[PDB]
Symmetry: D2
């Protein structure tokens, strides 16, 4: 009757769908990470404390606008709000900090432009500030090499459409053309740098500010990721790089970007400008599918609950979109304007928590785990065999949680790629590991502050008891319930090889 | 192959099918999911209705929550004018259905300060006076508000939530009276005129078919509507009531039950058994039950209708932002695609086409997304699952239908041509969800109109007289469908198509399947 | 109570493990028996009297073994098979076409006569010495000390330590001294040594030709005697199949070549052999001496699977009911082997000594008919059809789409039959490839088509004797009505039942595109 | 390349068959138990030693013939040959002893069409003539109706009841009718006692002689199993009861029998006489499937290599039968007259070892494990969750073994139920647990003879390193290979460790 368990048992996907019950309450735990873009409507400490209580797991800093002093104050407020709950480690919720780069752009130098008018695209810098309905200037000097006869040029976020030292185009879709407008070249392999000079400064600032992850704009190839990783350097070697896929090139060359990256962001907003909007769902389902196949985190972003910027309730499409991103297999869901500038940021966070939790119970785990189990490679890695063994055992006994002791998070990540129904309580002493764990579906990172015991067995048993107390206090399970515990054979990362099926004391 | 997501189609698992979805894999011309457009001030001119049909409109929905019989009668006349302007060519004529959506048991507010456009911005925490006095029915303000539910105080109690204007305004009950309610504005906002009111935790004792619904159903029978979308169906006896109201003269009108509340979801199975189809009416359903649970109700209803072989329509706020913007949000593109993937036979446009600034853009967008989503369907597991529902039937027409769908997959058929009197033979094929479009040739124009309720059916209306030799009449109808597929870009000469015919005239005799090349 | 019959409860199971759990001894099978029975004809079954009873008991193909006997001997056998077959031609409703198959001798190694006699036997004891000679003065003078064989290149292919197997590999010898014209051996396993016994050299690389001059004359004799098929012995490569195909020539181009996989090389080069051949025989007798006996079931499942995947006939052969040579009832292992061969996917099952020289040849044919009928209902068609469907999911051939639609329609209505009008047999073979549960009643006017239909599982061929009717719709209806009367009288279905009918849109072969779901009149 | 691993990775059963390769060698481990009926041809200590070397796991004693003194001397010789190898626990193979009871029996020229009269009056008890037939089953007319079939002497003669303290039959299939022959009543609910008078003494003797299991003959209902269980009593509470299904009623009431029993024997001999021989495979596949579903031992028996009683090589049907029983899911395969009275007993055992080892590699483990898990209930048992988690991990790392420390055998049986490809090395200090482990597919029982170390961690590591030494010595694995180890964690098997073999 609870957690969609009747639909969980179904032999077919059709019968699974038929049994979905609105009167089958979900469990307490919400596995999907919620990333909130911080802005005017949420950057105070008082609002941030409420965002954390509502469900925020990651604070996203949009570096498209704002100064370094502005972003440092936002980060400072995020940490003050986060540490206001640090007195109780049993209830403490780690909150990660993410840096979203601006990236390279193509800008124009108000007229009207009509369907059928002739428009010449010039590169000569004399008409840099003399743009009109006959001549238009752009700052991307390599455009004629990347463009061809028939190619389309989009101006002002796809509001204007054109068709090809200079270019001769015909206006397909018109509108009011203003100044310093963004340009997009659908299907073109653009040679803009992986990181602009501003991106270099912003990435170095993120290292100084101790950020957990970087959402790298306009990633088109593996070498773009490699450039970001070099700018982060030794000091930022542990910062996760999430590559944003925003154009045809990034979609077509997805597999090399995924291998080079720590994770992926389906940047639907920019992707929907470059590619036909009716195709974005294909790119979303393809990338979520491949990231789940590779065990790499995937973020679904843009306009998930857009109407909540002005309204306290989302539309029916918006509720459906959050649910379907979770059903697809997205590790995280994102709020942009909804939390940055909207009138109901707290309501937006709470809505994402409610939909995500409902959706996680409606996942067809029976076929999901069979397929992941089948497509899993046969290897000699003991941690990989332990992790699959733990997820298999967690389904057999319907455990309250899978408790994992982890230093770097890898052990908890290896369990998360198998998509257990049971929450993964990852106990760590590393605060960055705790913050970064939010990028992986199903991980509840708990930061142990107790000092290291001299008897290693006692230190392990201490951390297992901490996970039991966290699970009991947070309503995940109670005394007598069955849980799975993962530990290793010696201290240090890389030794997780032990699985126990144990009752809660 | 690099088209229609045929590489994804070949996957052995659902995970690999998702991994293979390709943005560079173009779909076939045909679009299977029906598009229902609510007709209104923005789209009721003949000029706009012609462009609506060219953009994709299959069904014209007339919402009886607003407007008089004269207004709706003119809209229906304009729909028929737009539709018949293409009748000079039977090879390119697209049948258009007319749907009457009932008002149902609605609770509504009055007019703000005498005008239907004036708005009073309510604030959070402010006290409000709900009145049942006909004097304040047109002088509604930020302090006093009139509604038309008279039995409100007996069904509602202190502490209950009262929702106003698509649930966007919340009012908690503090005090009650004979002709009044004292509430606290939990969620404030601009309160306009003639807005809907909801009471989710209430035993609303309103009638199944109200005096206005009786009048509207009668007007629908005189106007020859194809289908009724019955608002707020709570149980099977509500469906039977609408069926008895329509009587003999409305016996052929299809009844689509709208599921908009908890009781409807709970008693779904009996409602489905009595109805001709279902509408997941997400608008009210999202206020009546927690909004985070609407997707569960949606998928449960689409799954159960697909299992029972009955049409299901996904409705409300699919492309809502397109009322003001020419492009939808990413959530809106996703919702439409996901409804098609779930298995919805039809998708609906409400304010987007009835009152918005971009009605044709919304229709075209719904067409573009549906066709992309249809190719993305994992037909391999879907057909495998539908075949196992009733693995052994004694019906020879059912055996013929599944054999034709099996053959259509085998030869990646351009179409399944079906000769049908009542629509049944085409409906029987549509229940198996073939990738190939179904060209249903009929001489019954009501059948051609109603066919749009079933996913994949392209009704074509043969106008030629009945030939004396029945074999020549069959070959005349089959040749007309070949002409339709060619002119509409579904297939070309040489292509392989499936043909379903009977052994004698009349319904229920479809037993012949032929794999024939296009002449 | 329909589900209580033909294992339909087990058929409806969502898992193979649940399908096994639902297998019911009280669920009676249909009258139809899809797997073809091939009987080797010999002294116990050579008479017209016993051959009529073979046909009544279930024999579909008469196999003539060319390892023994002259052309004169095999001409009389073919005559008696055609006599017993045509003794039922008077009533076409009950006539059952019987095919004739010629099994070549091939590169075989045989011993000579024991003491000048064909029936004489001697006792070989364990550890004793046995000299193998190539000297023709001992050809009809073999005994416990000296054994002669016809393979003149034996000393060059074997060495000290080599194992030589005699008489179905029951007698084993180990080479202790290799001589200039002889081999001194030690009897590893002894027993009764008879005359003209087969010899196997598993280690050795025997250089005998694939198509010897005897095989060229035997194949040419088969063309003259209008045989339906050839069982080509010891096929090791595609070029061997092409040699048999060349000897048969244009005059015997419609005769089917079934390649017998009997050694390691045949198994290794299996894929090229299968593409070049019309069918495969899993010749377990020689294969289980050439390769370790415990690996034979691996080759059997591999070959049946690949033939089902390729849409080509596959026969399972040798020792299926071996104890029935001396006993009226089989062992439990024999009952299990016949059932598991049908469960694996073999189109045909075979009988060697059980019908060629045994004391109960009719009881052996009847037992194969009873077990195959039970194993056929027990097939898990749900997963089988799904896997077969996924092999070539997109085709341009309209008849391939028609065939698959007819099989899908036959499962939906659990039809009593799939009636197929066919000239060449292609349309019936296309249906049989999808493995329906329903028996395929193939109506044809071609007698060779009718006999060759037995190579494919489920095809019940009926020979139409009526002349071609003037109106083509009237000719189709006459042949459909003939199948209706065949099924009715044979117990496959009754009036009111639903059957699937496959016909063409125009006269001639290659136009089967019409499927009708009709009730039995 | 080895172990049919190309075929193992196939997406479909059809692709899996296509990939079976005769050149793909199996691992040295052979998972299926081999039960050998010991008789005049195999009861000498020296022959028994060779039978153990050839692969015998269980010595079966057919109590249908032979005195208690004869059978106890066979048991003495089996233990003598078994214990000759005890001086090396790394190579020592435990050997179980089974007692097969005789069971309740019905005892007595004909022509097809003749009128034969069955009489119940003891007047014709000594007059065994071909005109009237006497049976010693007094309730014969109450269990057979008009139209029923009566089989005489292993189903050589069949009769049909036409009239009904007497029966007027018509001989359906005739033959030569002798005296003191066996009688079988197809499809009848015979009310013969669950255990006859000799069976009780035989079962008592079994307990006296410390037998590991009993194959209870002619089990028709659950109460029959309960009757055997009562006779064995408190002294025989650990002896496993394997019910032999030999007739229609046993096949029909199989679910109630399996639940009451410790395991099942598919006694194809008698079953083939009671039901049509062409249906015996349906009953075998049903019983193996239900036993696999229930996690209870199933033994396939009778005529598996029958020709090997006189010949050194088996027929193709026999080689096929053994492989197909292993592929179906039989935990054990049996040899009757092939090892008890045949001329090639060692060759019969060696052939079963070779066929089974090839057939275990040919198992389509991918779909098997998926279906066992789908059909498995969501229990809160921690040992079941650990067992299933160990089997999943063993497939993921293709481990050389699942090492299980067990006292009673339960935790090794729980792993066996999920049919891992890897051998299950069960380390025990209980000699009866070591012997009985042979009933469960994939368990190689190793009897640790070392004293219990005072430090618990050192005791667990002695038992684990013993399994490591056993594995290397037997060829199951080498240094560096990954193994799965199941232990208790604290001084209730609930811990799984993935470790390289040292
Ligand atoms: Mg509504």
């Amino acid at each position: 009757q609870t957690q969609q368990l009747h639909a969980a048992m179904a032999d077919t996907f059709l019968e699974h769908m038929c049994r979905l019950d609105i009167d089958s309450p979900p469990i307490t735990a919400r596995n999907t990470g919620i990333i909130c873009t911080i802005g005017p409507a949420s950057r105070s400490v008082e609002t941030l404390k409420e965002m954390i209580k509502s469900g925020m797991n990651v604070a996203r800093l949009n570096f498209s606008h704002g100064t370094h002093e502005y972003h440092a104050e936002t980060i400072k407020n995020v940490r003050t709000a986060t540490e206001s709950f640090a007195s109780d480690p049993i209830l403490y919720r780690p909150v990660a900090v993410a840096l979203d780069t601006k990236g390279p752009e193509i800008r124009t130098g108000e007229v009207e432009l009509k369907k059928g008018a002739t428009l010449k695209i010039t590169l000569d810098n004399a008409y840099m500030e003399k743009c009109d309905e006959n001549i238009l200037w752009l700052d991307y000097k390599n455009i004629c090499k990347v463009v061809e006869v028939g190619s389309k040029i989009y101006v002002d976020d796809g509001l204007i459409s054109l068709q090809v030292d200079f270019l001769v185009t015909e206006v397909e879709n018109g509108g009011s053309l203003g100044s310093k407008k963004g340009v997009n070249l659908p299907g073109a392999a653009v040679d803009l740098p992986a990181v602009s000079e501003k991106d270099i400064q912003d990435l170095k600032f993120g290292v100084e500010q101790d950020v957990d992850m970087v959402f790298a704009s306009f990633i088109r190839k593996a070498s773009d990721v490699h450039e970001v990783r070099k700018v982060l350097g030794e000091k930022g070697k542990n910062i996760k790089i999430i590559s944003k896929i925003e154009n045809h090139e990034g979609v077509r060359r997805f597999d090399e970007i995924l291998e080079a990256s720590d994770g992926i962001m389906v940047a639907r907003g920019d992707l929907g400008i470059e590619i036909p909007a009716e195709k974005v769902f294909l790119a979303q389902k393809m990338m979520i599918g491949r990231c789940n196949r590779a065990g790499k985190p995937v973020i679904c972003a843009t306009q998930m609950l857009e109407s909540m910027i002005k309204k306290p309730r989302p539309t029916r499409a918006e509720g459906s979109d959050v649910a379907n991103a979770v059903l697809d297999g997205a590790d995280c869901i994102m709020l942009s304007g909804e939390t940055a500038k909207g009138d109901y940021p707290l309501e937006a966070v709470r809505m994402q928590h409610l939909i995500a939790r409902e959706a996680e119970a409606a996942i067809y785990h029976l076929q999901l785990f069979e397929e992941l189990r089948r497509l899993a490679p046969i290897t000699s890695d003991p941690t990989e065999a332990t992790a699959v063994g733990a997820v298999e055992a967690s389904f057999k006994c319907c455990s309250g949680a899978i408790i994992v002791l982890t230093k770097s998070g890898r052990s908890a990540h290896q369990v998360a790629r198998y998509r257990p129904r049971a929450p993964i309580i990852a106990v760590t002493r590393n605060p960055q590991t705790a913050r970064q764990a939010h990028l992986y579906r199903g991980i509840f990172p708990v930061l142990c502050k107790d000092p290291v015991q001299e008897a290693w067995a006692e230190d392990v048993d201490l951390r297992v008891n901490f996970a039991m107390n966290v699970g009991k206090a947070r309503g995940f399970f109670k005394k007598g319930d069955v849980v799975i515990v993962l530990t290793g054979w010696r201290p240090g990362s890389g030794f997780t090889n032990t699985m126990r099926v144990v009752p809660v004391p």
